[PDB]
Amino acid sequence: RHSRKLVLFIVFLALLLDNMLLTVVVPIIPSYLYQVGLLFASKATVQLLTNPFIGLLTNRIGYPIPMFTGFCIMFISTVMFAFSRSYAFLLFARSLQGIGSSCSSVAGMGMLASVYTDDEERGNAMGIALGGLAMGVLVGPPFGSVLYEFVGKTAPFLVLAALVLLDGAIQLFVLQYILIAAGSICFANMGIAMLEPALPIWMMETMCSHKWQLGVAFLPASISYLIGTNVFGILARRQLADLEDNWETLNDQVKDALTKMRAGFDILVGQIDDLKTTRNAYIQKYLERARSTLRWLCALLGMIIVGMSILCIPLAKNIYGLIAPNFGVGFAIGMVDSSMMPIMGYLVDLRHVSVYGSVYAIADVAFCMGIGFPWLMTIIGIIDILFAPLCF
Amino acid sequence: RHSRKLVLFIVFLALLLDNMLLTVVVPIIPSYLYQVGLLFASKATVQLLTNPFIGLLTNRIGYPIPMFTGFCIMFISTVMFAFSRSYAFLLFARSLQGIGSSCSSVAGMGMLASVYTDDEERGNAMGIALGGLAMGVLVGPPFGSVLYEFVGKTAPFLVLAALVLLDGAIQLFVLQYILIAAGSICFANMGIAMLEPALPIWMMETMCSHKWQLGVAFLPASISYLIGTNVFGILARRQLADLEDNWETLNDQVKDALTKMRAGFDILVGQIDDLKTTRNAYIQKYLERARSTLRWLCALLGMIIVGMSILCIPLAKNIYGLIAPNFGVGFAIGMVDSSMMPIMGYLVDLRHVSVYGSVYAIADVAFCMGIGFPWLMTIIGIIDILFAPLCF
């Protein structure tokens, strides 16, 4: 009823503000120019790295809590970006914006999916939310440019912060240790996208003159993704087989021997047996814990692999020296997906919209002139091109 | 069996060569430079305009016939583009490639969908075909550049023509007055994309300095699309009710029915009534014929509207003068879709992949440097951004 419409409005505004914050910086780029590529892609990289952790956190705790802290982070980071003047401060504010926007978007989409039960209504709500997400990137630049050129210099950022604050207030009123681990995760995700070397002294002449070297250096990520997509399946099959192999003995005067080898919840189960439903419940209750632990392990392993590869990239003097790191990165981005797809399905849509809007805006701003070459965003774009049309 | 695998291989190769032909020209652009945006986007514009007509033609006649003429057109136009040296000849060859590739791709995808009956197998085949379609754009530039800078000047075009010929031969051997209307349809689609004034004398300065003018000029196509999406539904609902009302009076005793009967095929049907199944069959078949005629009419009307708008575009003297033509174009592109989606569903996937690959390649080539602003491709991109994530 009224609550469903309120939730839909809140989620729509959250996604719209997310993409507006992503794209609004395009008309201001020449003014700063009087390095740019990394400053532009930092938010997208951070969000694309940190989405699955927020998904798992919302699965564990719940939906309403992450949205408020996401709104607060977005507000604080937007204000800091508005009032900052130094390159490092701008980059830090951009990364904070990325984390906050990712958390808010994922949690809001999850709650909106949870509220609607009927299939067709759920599809309509998803369509409206994704439409707002997609049209934010187009409404960004004109709104930003008109406010920038009529009134003030930092007006668009303050207006967006005010909108964020108003939406948070509407969510709060009208609607009716682990901490160190979360801090470490946030800091690692910031650090991965904050620092990136490129060796532009000889790399520029390399890509401009000959592109076949670029292709042979950058395509093996596609093979690595396919190789790494199977890890969760393999491990889950092994874990499922292991428990049933043990329980086969219990499956089989001998009953007293079975009770003896059983020998305190398991003891109580063995006593109350002397059935099939009990062992079914036992398997189900252990299986979920195994799944959750394995998902956490694979997410951490993927983050570690990406960090190690980005730390190992700069120590190369040839194009072929770039073959080894790429094979790493495309692996990790695969593995994480293998654990997240069965439970949540809108991560593909969010990543696709973000990447495609970023490419659209970059093409527009590049055409506008008449800036640096991002490394991880190229891999993300290649993977998206190859495997998002196939998935749909 | 062998037949299904052979069809899958043929369709995969056809789609791969389609996209490779689309993208391979990128590394050659700077060499030719030492005007170009239209030359790059002509093929995409022509294909996106001419897809639905080929879809209807294949629905009417059959799948095998269009593929062979598409292969022949692709071969001839690729050779002509290879051996040409003048701007007009290059543009004409590009448009011919566009028509041939569109026909081959649509017909092959249709036949591949037709062969597979099982749902999961059909999904797998569609996934493989779209994977080839999507990887063509990445395999294009490296292959083209390496062939260009190792051997010869026109080697990649000849190699692609040879591959086209080999695939056509495999299709022909191993596998076991409307004409003037089709000619006019082809010529009009060529002419729409061949000529575009775009008025670049002062549009660039008022587009780069201020972006809100660009937004207010280009966004209303999104509203026009939503308005025009309902045309087929409204017309079909009106048409069905008119036929139903006439027969409902006679639907209802027997004496009155005979009395009305007192006043060749229709006579035979009326005699054999003296039942319900005959009425059902009559209604279904006449409705089907009416729907087919209405689809043809709306496709022609959309083409006419687009042509009139592109002829009326150059007259405008101010930015606001571009508001009226856009409201036209976004209408037609909507209306055609309203008639094509219920029967065929891969048109959205084909258009999305083509547009997104084109934007990716344009961004790459623009980034590599260090002119030309397409008009209709911008509208297509806006519509795709806004309404493809929602549709998926």
Numbering used by the authors:
A (entry chain B), B (entry chain A): 16 to 49, 133 to 274, 296 to 371, 384 to 394, 423 to 433, 453 to 548, 563 to 584
Report text from the authors:
Vesicular monoamine transporter 2 (VMAT2) is responsible for H+-dependent uptake of monoamine neurotransmitters, e.g. dopamine (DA) and serotonin (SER), from the cytoplasm to presynaptic vesicles in monoaminergic neurons. Vesicular monoamine transporter 2 (VMAT2) belongs to the major facilitator superfamily (MFS), and mediates cytoplasmic monoamine packaging into presynaptic vesicles. Substrates bind to MFS transporters between N-domain and C-domain, and are transported by a rocker-switch alternating access mechanism. In this work, we report two cryo-EM structures of VMAT2, with VMAT2 from Xenopus laevis adopting a canonical MFS fold and an engineered VMAT2 from Ovis aries adopting a non-canonical fold.
In the end, OaVMAT2 with the TM8/9 loop replaced by BRIL (OaVMAT2TM8/9-BRIL) or AmpC (OaVMAT2TM8/9-AmpC) yielded stable proteins with reasonable gel-filtration profiles. Subsequent cryo-EM single-particle analysis revealed OaVMAT2TM8/9-BRIL structure at 3.2 Å resolution. Interestingly, the OaVMAT2TM8/9-BRIL structure is organized as a homodimer, which was also confirmed by chemical crosslinking using glutaraldehyde. Surprisingly, OaVMAT2TM8/9-BRIL C-domain is folded in a unique way that is distinct from canonical MFS C-domains, which usually have TM11 and TM12 arranged near TM7. However, in OaVMAT2TM8/9-BRIL C-domain, TM11 and TM12 are positioned away from TM7, but close to TM8 and TM10. Interestingly, OaVMAT2TM8/9-BRIL retains binding capability to both dopamine (Kd = 0.68 ± 0.23 μM) and serotonin (Kd = 0.33 ± 0.10 μM). Notably, the basic amine group of dopamine/serotonin interacts with the acidic side group of D402 (TM10) via a salt bridge and the main-chain carbonyl oxygen of I398 (TM10) via a hydrogen bond. Meanwhile, the VMAT2 inhibitor reserpine bound to OaVMAT2WT with a high affinity (Kd = 16.0 ± 5.7 nM), but did not bind to OaVMAT2TM8/9-BRIL. Interestingly, crosslinked OaVMAT2TM8/9-AmpC also showed a minor dimer band, while the rest of the protein appeared as a monomer band (and a high-molecular-weight aggregate band). This data suggests that the oligomeric state of wild-type OaVMAT2WT is different from that of OaVMAT2TM8/9-BRIL (and maybe also OaVMAT2TM8/9-AmpC), and the dimer form of OaVMAT2TM8/9-BRIL may be an artifact induced by its non-canonical fold and engineering.
